[PDB]
């Protein structure tokens, strides 16, 4: 039967063009809300038919593509806890109980999403020559899509809210944290503008259904398209555009209109509910969605109709959530971006506080500031030895042999020595930094590190006193070496013979005394 | 008398359905603000009576349920500092001074909340056949509820603002940090919309009380319901809906109205102040509350009346506070959610900075990036040994025996050994990771860790040279073992005999040299 | 921690007093961590400015 193993590469693209199907499926459900239109020629309420076949086709052509996922997790192994395994889990390709492994928790949420519930509402309407069913199609689309939002957004939640916590294919920039919470706005605006469109047509249907009864010579079947060849429609036809105009007109300047449309008067006064261009209607509703989600309903002037008020409350709450999520994921990105700079500024404020508290002389305060600025310019806050010590030992040894082998193999006692032990010497070379006019050593002081110069120029006088220069590649500290390999010394740090002043800003690699005894005790 | 001990389970449900009573009590006090209505039939100002009995009943049926709490902290013990105790405190069930322990600080704030102050305002109004008291009921409800807000919100402050700092029953998701600061909006909107309703009726009362004096043939007693059978009401009845209409009409299009209602003209022009449906009135006021708290008063067009201006200033300030709290608790949640991912991105930016500063070759830069991505894929930022070392020793030993016992009991010198000492060997097994084509050891190098393979496949050649494979469950590093248990070696790390290349990504458990001498010195 | 352990209030005042005094003097700054991250010549000159007259 070939029950699949869970880390197959075939179940890596069938979960790559699969979560894309779960993403594109919650964009198609709002397009069923643009199905009711108003035919302004006939003043009847109708259904867009080549948007009905379009949304039914594009939702079915995703859901039977989805039907090749519970027919494949049907063939699925899993991992179970055991101490027999040697490898963190058993794989069970036995088909007798993996069926229950799939169909005990994560089948019902995934089965209540491929159900063609908004496709059978469209079905018995478009297969008729009778206009009586415009009511039922508009009746059975708000709440079915509203309740199937929950299984369709719960089958994208583990693949988004935990693929943002531990992301898989992204590290480096802002193309999945800002460009995800900004397309979460564009999705929610797409859903909210479609609710606004559909509820705007329901309020216009309510107005027309109540203004037709007050006229008396009208049945509410006459307000729907396809009911023109009915008896009594001819006496209603000559009184349509006075009854529906004196009672159900929508203007944005009326403060006491005959019917209050509230937040839906912008939809009926602009005429997008009777728009023949779908680009105009979709763009106008999507922008209403984004404008009222972005501004938390601020500018909504609702009527005293409780479903409309509750729809406005939902917009305010959803916009508050969406805004808090966006600025919280942008602050989390920006704070992690400038973390070393803010650490440098905290460390810099601490040093000013400590030097003011201790009242250091200003020549000693300039030397502290100079070293801190130089260390920030070179390292940028990065602890290099902590980065190196967290690498594998082979990668450590290769990186350290790239950085420090030519420096150690210019010492004459180290170049002719070995390869075994100098590759243990250039694992303790740590980087030192020296600002200008820093005395690296002065005479009489114990030499406690050998320095192999990377960058910058130095100086050396001993006892106008036969000066000696030092530059990029040379070393300094050979008094420590001969002392350390000689066993006739003990722990006796030898005195310095030279005064070594940093002529420029210097980088070096330092080999301290106790790290030199360990490589001298390998004989 | 049975004075209770403070960690009884009976005083765990009598503080579970108790803080729910403290939460539901600050939702009932705004319902006294919807008591004044306008009877649009008679054009009189009245009182809703079956909302008066409803809010009085539902506040009394919470406060004498609350009266079984200071009758139970009456029977209460506490904990006092002493060094006699052995157990961090004395319990005092002596009833002579625990009364002062309750009634010295946290009795007055809790006693000034069960007071039926808004229930006695309702009392002498609904027990009469005279209309004269509509004034006093509306007079004594704004400031009494406004000043009893302070004891009723101070008896929920220690149980919310410190049960959010150290929560008791919640850990894992966003159902108490977003769904608490969003229902803090819905509470404040519930309070603010009720103030807006009540102050809107007070401004309409001011208009009517001043437009009745200007007519001259009217007493201000005539403006209240229940004063119809008074002398002179018949001459006022035929001039009501010209006097109160030319002087006290509320429209939203008038820019110079005869009376300025300001932020309260939306309440009187919509007609919710005379609404018979309480769902319409409550929803319309709650949405005004949420819309003007969410948008901080922006769309308020106040009059030049100072109490209304001060009410608007309070809305702007309260909305600023509520918004800062919501986005600050959402950023705190989201930042703690993606903490390991942001740590990985900081560590990843540091490595790029360091490899660019040191100018590593690109083959060495790919090996660093590959190991960091592999380590992030396996561990997800989690320091496993720090998690294990913070566990109890029995739990450590059981977890480590689950993870690492079958691996150690496949070594032939360890399987026949013991149980005592191999359970001390599998407490030092730490997890290693190897990317593909990583040389775990090469010949001539000192073997310094034994590796027990968890996952991935390996390779082994020695001196096309009789290759040897390694896979899930086998080990590698037996040259370290026989060296370490032999005392005829000293501290002499033996040379390698094989070249071991990771054929796949490998997990292992590593036993280093100095952790193997400690288990070899147990003989 | 002092509420959990139920310290006497004379021992709780001594803890609060030291913490307020340490915050007033150091302002959260770890001085020895600042000094130990300096170059050895700068360490020696700063420490000879701070502490030489006291030892001598």
Report residue A383 CA to chain centroid gap: 28
How close is the nearest chain B Cα to the Cα of C13, in Å?
14
> Shortest CB distance from C7 goes to which of B79, B81, B85?
B81
Q: Annotation-wise, does B451 bind a ligand?
A: yes
Closest C-alpha to B305, from B232, B207, B208, B376: B207
In contact, A190 and A30? CB cutoff 8 Å? yes
Residue A141 CB partners (closer than 8 Å, separation 6+): A32, A33, A35, A118, A121, A198
Burial A183-220 (b: 16+ CB within 10 A, else e): ebbeebbbbbbbbbbbbbbbbbbebbeebbeeeeebee
Pairing state of beta strands B458-460 and B468-470? antiparallel
Integer Cα distance of B294 and A318 in angstroms: 12
Q: Annotation-wise, does A172 bind a ligand?
A: no
Does the beta carbon of A168 lie under 8 angstroms from any beta carbon of chain C? no
Handedness of CA B2, B3, B8, B9 (dihedral sign): positive
In contact, A334 and A327? CB cutoff 8 Å? no
Mutate to test the interface with A, among C24, C32, C34, C47 (most CBs of A within 10 A): C34
Handedness of CA A405, A408, A409, A414 (dihedral sign): negative
Per-residue CA distances from A332 to A53, A329, B333, B336, B351 (Å): 44, 5, 10, 9, 20
Length of chain B: 523
How far is it between the farthest Cα atoms of chain B? 125
Mutate to test the interface with A, among B184, B284, B365, B453 (most CBs of A within 10 A): B284
Tokens at B30, concatenated: 């705004």
Residue B415 CB partners (closer than 8 Å, separation 6+): B408, B409
- The secondary element (H helix, E strand) that includes residue B198 is helix B183-215
Instruction: Read off φ and ψ for residue A185, nearest 5 degrees.
Output: -60, -40
Cβ distance C34 to A351 less than 8 Å, yes or no, reads yes
Q: A104-112: long-range contacts at Cβ-Cβ below 8 A with a sequence spacing of 24 or more?
A: A107/A70, A109/A151, A109/A154, A109/A155, A110/A69, A110/A70, A110/A151, A110/A155, A111/A70, A112/A148, A112/A151
Q: Collect all residues of chain C within an 8 Å Cβ-Cβ radius of residue B82.
A: 6
How close is the nearest chain A Cα to the Cα of C54, in Å?
14
Q: Collect all residues of chain C within an 8 Å Cβ-Cβ radius of residue B88.
A: 4-6
Closest C-alpha to B442, from B481, B497, B483, B480: B497
Integer Cα distance of B133 and B441 in angstroms: 96
Name beta bridge partners: B80.
B90
Integer Cα distance of B221 and B202 in angstroms: 15
In chain B, which residues are followed by a C-to-N distance beyond 2.5 Å, i.e. a gap?
463
How close is the nearest chain A Cα to the Cα of C34, in Å?
7
Q: A511-518: long-range contacts at Cβ-Cβ below 8 A with a sequence spacing of 24 or more?
A: A511/A425, A511/A428, A511/A429, A511/A449, A511/A450, A511/A451, A511/A452, A511/A477, A511/A480, A512/A428, A512/A448, A512/A449, A513/A447, A513/A448, A513/A449, A513/A480, A513/A484, A515/A428, A516/A450, A516/A480, A516/A481, A516/A484, A517/A484, A518/A428
Resolution of the PDB structure in angstroms? 2.5
Per-residue CA distances from B106 to A146, A289, B467, C24 (Å): 48, 50, 80, 33
Integer Cα distance of A516 and A486 in angstroms: 12
How close is the nearest chain B Cα to the Cα of A381, in Å?
8
Residue B198 CB partners (closer than 8 Å, separation 6+): B33, B34, B36, B138, B141, B142
Per-residue CA distances from A217 to A124, A135, A234, A249 (Å): 30, 20, 10, 20
C10, closest residue in chain B (CA to CA): B81
Tokens at A268, concatenated: 């009926």
The residue behind tokens 């006692």 is: A413
The residue behind tokens 């030519």 is: A406
Integer Cα distance of B206 and B139 in angstroms: 12
What DSSP assignment string belongs to B319-367? HHHHHHHHHHHHHHHHHHHSHHHHHHHHHHHHHHHHHHHHT--HHHHHH
B78, closest residue in chain C (CA to CA): C6
Residue A121 CB partners (closer than 8 Å, separation 6+): A136, A137, A140, A141, A144
Name beta bridge partners: B510.
B430, B451
Burial B485-516 (b: 16+ CB within 10 A, else e): eeeeeeeeebebebbbbbbebbbbbbbbbebb
In contact, B201 and B285? CB cutoff 8 Å? no
In contact, A519 and A436? CB cutoff 8 Å? no
How close is the nearest chain B Cα to the Cα of C33, in Å?
22
The upper half-sphere exposure of residue A248, i.e. CA atoms within 13 Å in the direction of its Cβ, equals 25
What DSSP assignment string belongs to B119-163? HHTTHHHHT-S-GGGHHHHHHTTHHHHHHHHHHHHHTTSTTTTTT
Mutate to test the interface with C, among B7, B80, B81 (most CBs of C within 10 A): B81
Length of chain C: 56
Integer Cα distance of B450 and B488 in angstroms: 20
In contact, A196 and A289? CB cutoff 8 Å? yes
Q: Annotation-wise, does A401 bind a ligand?
A: no
In contact, A34 and A194? CB cutoff 8 Å? yes
In contact, A494 and A446? CB cutoff 8 Å? yes
How close is the nearest chain C Cα to the Cα of A70, in Å?
54
In contact, B3 and B76? CB cutoff 8 Å? yes
Burial label for A448, CB within 10 Å (0-12, 13-18, 19+), is: middle
The answer for B 227-266 residues in CB contact with A (under 8 A) is 251-253
Closest C-alpha to A368, from A383, A384, A353: A353
Q: For chain C, which chains pass the contact test of at least 3 CB pairs under 8 Å?
A: A, B
A295, closest residue in chain B (CA to CA): B295
What DSSP assignment string belongs to B167-194? -SS--SSSSSSHHHHTHHHHHHHHHHHH
Mutate to test the interface with A, among B197, B337, B343, B432 (most CBs of A within 10 A): B337
Cβ distance B344 to A171 less than 8 Å, yes or no, reads yes
Q: Annotation-wise, does A368 bind a ligand?
A: no
Name beta bridge partners: B475.
B452
In contact, A392 and B434? CB cutoff 8 Å? yes
Q: A93-102: long-range contacts at Cβ-Cβ below 8 A with a sequence spacing of 24 or more?
A: A93/A3, A93/A4, A93/A5, A94/A3, A95/A1, A95/A3, A98/A3, A99/A74, A101/A76, A102/A70, A102/A73, A102/A74, A102/A76
What DSSP assignment string belongs to A53-90? HHHHHHHHHHHHHHTTTTTTSSSB--EE--SS-SSS-E
Tokens at A399, concatenated: 């990186």
Does the beta carbon of B88 lie under 8 angstroms from any beta carbon of chain C? yes
Q: For chain A, which chains pass the contact test of at least 3 CB pairs under 8 Å?
A: B, C
Integer Cα distance of A486 and A478 in angstroms: 13
Integer Cα distance of B193 and B204 in angstroms: 16
Integer Cα distance of A198 and A192 in angstroms: 10
Q: Collect all residues of chain A within an 8 Å Cβ-Cβ radius of residue B361.
A: 402
In contact, B28 and B59? CB cutoff 8 Å? yes
How was it solved?
cryo-EM
C1, closest residue in chain B (CA to CA): B88
Q: Annotation-wise, does A378 bind a ligand?
A: no
In contact, A58 and A95? CB cutoff 8 Å? no
Q: Annotation-wise, does A413 bind a ligand?
A: yes
Residue A265 CB partners (closer than 8 Å, separation 6+): A250, A251, A252, A257
Cβ distance C45 to A367 less than 8 Å, yes or no, reads yes
In contact, B208 and B218? CB cutoff 8 Å? no
A501, closest residue in chain C (CA to CA): C41
In contact, B118 and C45? CB cutoff 8 Å? no
What DSSP assignment string belongs to B424-493? HHTTS-EEEEE-TT-EEE-TTSBP-EEEEEEES-EEEB------EEE-BTBEE-HHHHHHHH-SSS-S-P
How close is the nearest chain A Cα to the Cα of C55, in Å?
17
The upper half-sphere exposure of residue A132, i.e. CA atoms within 13 Å in the direction of its Cβ, equals 5
Pairing state of beta strands A475-476 and A449-455? antiparallel
Read off the DSSP letter of residue A383. Answer: -
Burial label for B467, CB within 10 Å (0-12, 13-18, 19+), is: exposed
Name beta bridge partners: B45.
B38, B224
In chain A, which residues are followed by a C-to-N distance beyond 2.5 Å, i.e. a gap?
463
Closest C-alpha to B106, from B66, B78, B73: B73
B282, closest residue in chain A (CA to CA): A306
Does the beta carbon of B294 lie under 8 angstroms from any beta carbon of chain A? yes
B87, closest residue in chain C (CA to CA): C5
The residue behind tokens 């790290």 is: A515
Does the beta carbon of C41 lie under 8 angstroms from any beta carbon of chain A? yes
Q: Collect all residues of chain C within an 8 Å Cβ-Cβ radius of residue B81.
A: 6-9
Tokens at A271, concatenated: 């005429």
In contact, B31 and B194? CB cutoff 8 Å? yes
Per-residue CA distances from B257 to B198, B209, B262 (Å): 21, 17, 10
Q: Annotation-wise, does B347 bind a ligand?
A: no
Integer Cα distance of A478 and A52 in angstroms: 87
Name beta bridge partners: B468.
B460
Tokens at A64, concatenated: 């039977």
């Amino acid at each position: 039967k070939k029950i699949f193993d869970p880390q197959d590469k075939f179940l890596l693209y069938c979960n790559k063009l699969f979560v894309a199907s779960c993403i594109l499926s919650v964009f198609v459900d709002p397009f069923f809300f643009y199905l009711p239109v108003i035919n302004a020629e006939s003043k009847c309420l109708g259904i867009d038919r080549k948007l009905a076949i379009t949304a039914s086709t594009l939702r079915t052509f995703i859901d039977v593509f989805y039907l090749a996922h519970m027919a494949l997790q049907l063939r699925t192994a899993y991992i179970a806890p055991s101490s027999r395994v040697f490898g963190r889990g058993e794989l069970v390709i036995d088909p007798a109980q993996i069926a229950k492994r799939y169909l005990q928790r994560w089948f019902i949420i995934d089965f209540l999403s491929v159900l063609p519930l908004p496709q059978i509402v469209v079905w018995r309407f478009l297969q008729s020559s009778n206009g009586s069913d415009v009511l039922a199609t508009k009746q059975a689309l708000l709440f079915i899509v509203l309740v199937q939002y929950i299984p369709r957004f719960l089958r994208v939640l583990p693949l988004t809210s935990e693929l943002k916590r531990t992301a898989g294919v992204f590290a480096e920039t802002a193309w999945a944290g800002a460009a995800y919470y900004l397309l979460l706005y564009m999705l929610a605006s797409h859903i909210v503008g479609a609710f606004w469109y559909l509820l705007a047509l329901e309020r216009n249907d309510a107005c027309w259904q109540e203004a037709c009864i007050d006229a008396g010579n009208c049945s509410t079947d006459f307000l729907y398209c396809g009911n023109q060849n009915m008896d009594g429609y001819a006496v209603w036809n000559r009184a349509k555009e006075s009854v529906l105009k004196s009672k159900c007109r929508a203007d944005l300047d009326d403060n006491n209109p005959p019917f209050d449309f509230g937040i839906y008067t912008q939809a009926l006064s602009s005429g997008i509910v009777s728009s023949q261009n779908f680009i105009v209607k979709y763009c106008y509703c999507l922008w209403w969605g984004l404008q009222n989600l972005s501004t938390l309903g601020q500018g909504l002037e609702t009527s005293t109709y409780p479903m409309e008020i509750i729809f406005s409350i939902s917009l305010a709450i959803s916009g508050l959530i969406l805004f808090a999520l966006l600025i919280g994921n942008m602050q989390t990105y920006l704070q992690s971006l400038t973390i070393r700079l803010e650490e440098m500024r905290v460390k810099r404020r601490d040093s000013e506080q400590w030097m003011h508290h201790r009242m250091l002389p200003q020549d000693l305060r300039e030397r502290v500031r100079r070293y801190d600025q130089y260390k920030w310019l070179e390292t940028r806050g990065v602890d290099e030895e902590y980065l190196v010590q967290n690498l594998p030992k082979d990668l450590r040894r290769d990186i350290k042999r790239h950085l420090c082998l030519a420096l150690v193999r210019r010492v004459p006692l180290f170049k002719s020595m070995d390869d075994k032990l100098l590759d243990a010497i250039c694992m303790r070379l740590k980087p030192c930094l020296f600002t200008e006019s820093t005395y690296l050593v002065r005479e009489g002081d114990p030499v406690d590190e050998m320095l192999f110069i990377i960058r910058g120029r130095l100086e050396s006088v001993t006892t106008f006193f036969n000066r000696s220069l030092l530059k990029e590649g040379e070393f300094c500290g050979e008094e420590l070496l001969t002392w350390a390999l000689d066993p006739k010394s003990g722990v006796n740090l030898p005195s310095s013979t030279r005064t070594v002043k940093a002529l420029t800003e210097v980088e070096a690699f330092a080999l301290t005394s106790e790290e030199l005894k360990f490589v001298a005790s390998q004989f």
